[PDB]
């Protein structure tokens, strides 16, 4: 049996750790909701 516990509030926080790149990927989504890279 799955359960839930609160982890925090949903607010925008200034001065947060800024990381990660912005890639443009050609993808396809199947009937099962799974993405796959089209090349």
């Amino acid at each position: 049996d799955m359960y839930i516990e609160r982890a925090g509030d949903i607010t925008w926080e200034k001065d947060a750790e800024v990381t990660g790149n912005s890639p443009r990927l050609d993808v396809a989504l199947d009937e099962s909701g799974d993405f796959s890279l089209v090349e």
Binding site: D1, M2, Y3, I4, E5, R6, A7, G8, D9, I10, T11, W12, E13, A16, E17, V18, T19, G20, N21, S22, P23, R24, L25, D26, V27, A28, L29, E31, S32, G33, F35, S36, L37
Partner: protein, 154 residues
């Protein structure tokens, strides 16, 4: 039932394992379908029964319809309020990329976190939830790029 971000846990395996994350907003619990697989949830003495769900959109709402309607503007940076297993909730600011599909383009966050982080909200500057993290693709370097998955509000 207080508004906010929540961990989705299970006792079926060894100890207390975190299977995913979700957002409580307006008395409705939102999460990625692959986290619960449509199963009912528990919140202390109360019980959350599913109301709406779709495997392709990979989304599911509990107690009422999907309430989240905000969207990425294609221009500004967003924040993934990441809630990782056994670790404290933390906002990670990033600029999204694009998943280009035959049905349209979608925002994409290139942050790598364990699969138990699935369901963490993606936020805009107004603190509004613009999507959920957890459904994407594995790139050439083994890392994960997740889509910004948002449902529909009726």
């Amino acid at each position: 039932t207080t508004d906010g971000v929540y961990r989705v846990m299970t006792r079926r395996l060894l100890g207390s394992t975190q299977v995913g994350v979700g957002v409580m907003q307006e008395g409705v619990f939102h999460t990625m379908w692959h986290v619960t697989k449509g199963a009912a949830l528990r919140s202390g003495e109360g019980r959350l029964d599913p109301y709406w769900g779709d495997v392709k959109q990979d989304l599911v709402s509990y107690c009422g319809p999907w309430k989240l309607d905000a969207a990425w503007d294609g221009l500004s940076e967003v924040q993934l309020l990441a809630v990782p297993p056994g670790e404290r909730a933390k906002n990670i600011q990033t600029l999204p990329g694009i998943f280009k599909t035959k049905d349209g383009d979608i925002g994409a966050v290139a942050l790598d976190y364990p699969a138990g982080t699935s369901g963490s909200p993606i936020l805009d500057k107004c603190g509004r939830v613009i999507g959920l993290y957890g459904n994407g693709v594995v790139i050439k370097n083994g890392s994960y790029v997740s889509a910004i998955t948002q449902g529909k509000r009726e």
